Structure 1
Amino acid sequence: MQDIRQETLNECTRAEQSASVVLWEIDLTEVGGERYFFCNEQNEKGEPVTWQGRQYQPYPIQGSGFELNGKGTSTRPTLTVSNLYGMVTGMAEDMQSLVGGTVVRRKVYARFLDAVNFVNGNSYADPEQEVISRWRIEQCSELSAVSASFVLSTPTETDGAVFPGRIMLANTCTWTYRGDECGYSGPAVADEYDQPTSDITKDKCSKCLSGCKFRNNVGNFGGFLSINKLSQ
């Protein structure tokens, strides 16, 4: 079972229950953007819905295809949002179509919402009553002058990955420059075409043996400089 509080379980079994609001958060901070908060509805005072002290702005947003199935294909939900006034378009041209971001969905009973939402207040207000799910944006499936649809995926989604991944090559380093395995921390030496440079913003290894020799890092070279003759 999910680890959710006893109040939500008590509310779930009631015959007459409050409305279940769904609050959405789009997190593009790991892809160079900001965090946006949305809810399909305003409150009774015509204001963005306040949950746990955070304001979720009114915007037409609706998700579907949420399920937990282990057998078969990994579940790919979808999220449809309003593209009137071209707001999502603005995000698509600034965040590489939002691809790689995070989507956080919270299910909250309206009875536990913050007291500021309601005119008469909320006696049973409880900021710890929520059900949280996290997904990732895989593809902006449709973007038009009206709406925008995003495909979501589980963060694991072992789709394009292979195992083992490290490939045995000659004349080319598979390490990441100035990474842990490369283990280089020296000054700027040259660019990716081996041309010497003292510019730190233009310093990149050519990944060839000459590029490694430029840094005196041949010991940590990621290639195997004999296999090209034994493979004949």
Structure 2
Amino acid sequence: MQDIRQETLNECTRAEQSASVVLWEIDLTEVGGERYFFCNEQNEKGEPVTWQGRQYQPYPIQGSGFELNGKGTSTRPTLTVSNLYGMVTGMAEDMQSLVGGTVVRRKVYARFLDAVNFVNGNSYADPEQEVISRWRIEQCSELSAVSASFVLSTPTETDGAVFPGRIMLANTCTWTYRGDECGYSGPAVADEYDQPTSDITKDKCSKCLSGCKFRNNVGNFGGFLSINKLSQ
């Protein structure tokens, strides 16, 4: 079942419905950007739409093909944004083409916007009645001087992944540096190569046996020293 409130569910069955507004939120904080609020529509005063106090500025946007299914390939709805004045290109070259971010789609009925969007003032206002979905951007399939097309995907999508993620053994380690399994917290001693150093900026581990010998941490080495089992 959905989390839709009783009153909006009751209203949705009415024969004379109101306008349907769709608002989009693009979040890049997990990538290193900001939060952008877009709305395909504005109010009657030529102003950005005010919802829950915040303002969604008017900007071109259109979502298509939102499907949910349990069988076959996971659905990939698309999003179209007009790239005029190079606004999208301004962040595409900075945020690595908007790959890895999050998009949030909220749908709302027109009779629940804030009173400031209507000249007379809506008395039937409730800022806690909306339907929310979230997806992640996958790729920018098209980018030109007039538009831009993004593909969306479910966060849980399991394309191109393998279940057991261990290589068992090698001549090299198979973890991170200073994680919760390597368990190193000392001063800098080694860098990308096997060269002594004492700066925290260029602390790197070659993930070989020599790095462990340098860091006096061999008991946590993730490489089984077999080698000759394949030969002999």
TM category (shorter chain) comes to over 0.9
Identity of aligned residues (%): 100
* Matched-pair contact (CA < 8 Å) for 1:25–1:38: yes
Residue matched to 1:155: 155
User: What is the CA–CA distance in structure 2 between the aligned matches of 1:167 and 1:120, rounded to whole Å?
Assistant: 67
* Matched-pair contact (CA < 8 Å) for 1:63–1:77: yes
1:11 deviates by 1.5
User: What is the CA–CA distance in structure 2 between the aligned matches of 1:228 and 1:91, rounded to whole Å?
Assistant: 52
After superposition, where does 1:164-175 map in structure 2 within 5 Å? 164-175=164-175
For the aligned residues, what is the CA RMSD? Answer: 1.1
The C-alpha deviation readout for 1:121-167, integer Å capped at 9, x for no partner, is: 11111111010000000001111000000000000110011010111
The C-alpha deviation readout for 1:90-115, integer Å capped at 9, x for no partner, is: 11000000100000000011111111
- TM-score normalised by length of structure 2: 0.97
* Matched-pair contact (CA < 8 Å) for 1:170–1:228: no
Residue matched to 2:140: 140
User: What is the CA–CA distance in structure 1 between the aligned matches of 2:36 and 2:207, rounded to whole Å?
Assistant: 40
Match of 1:8, SS? helix
1:224 deviates by 1.1
Residue matched to 1:107: 107
1:184 deviates by 1.1
Q: Which runs of 4+ in 1 moved over 4 A?
A: none
The C-alpha deviation readout for 1:192-230, integer Å capped at 9, x for no partner, is: 101111111100110001011111111111111224544
- TM-score normalised by length of structure 1: 0.97
Aligned length: 232
Match of 1:31, SS? coil
Pair 142,184 (structure 1): closer, same or farther in 2 beyond 3 Å: same
User: What is the CA–CA distance in structure 1 between the aligned matches of 2:127 and 2:231, rounded to whole Å?
Assistant: 64
Pair 145,215 (structure 1): closer, same or farther in 2 beyond 3 Å: same
1:19 deviates by 0.7
1:231 deviates by 5.6
Pair 196,47 (structure 1): closer, same or farther in 2 beyond 3 Å: same
Q: Which of the two has greater helix per residue?
A: 1
Match of 1:29, SS? coil
Unmatched 5+ stretches in structure 2? none
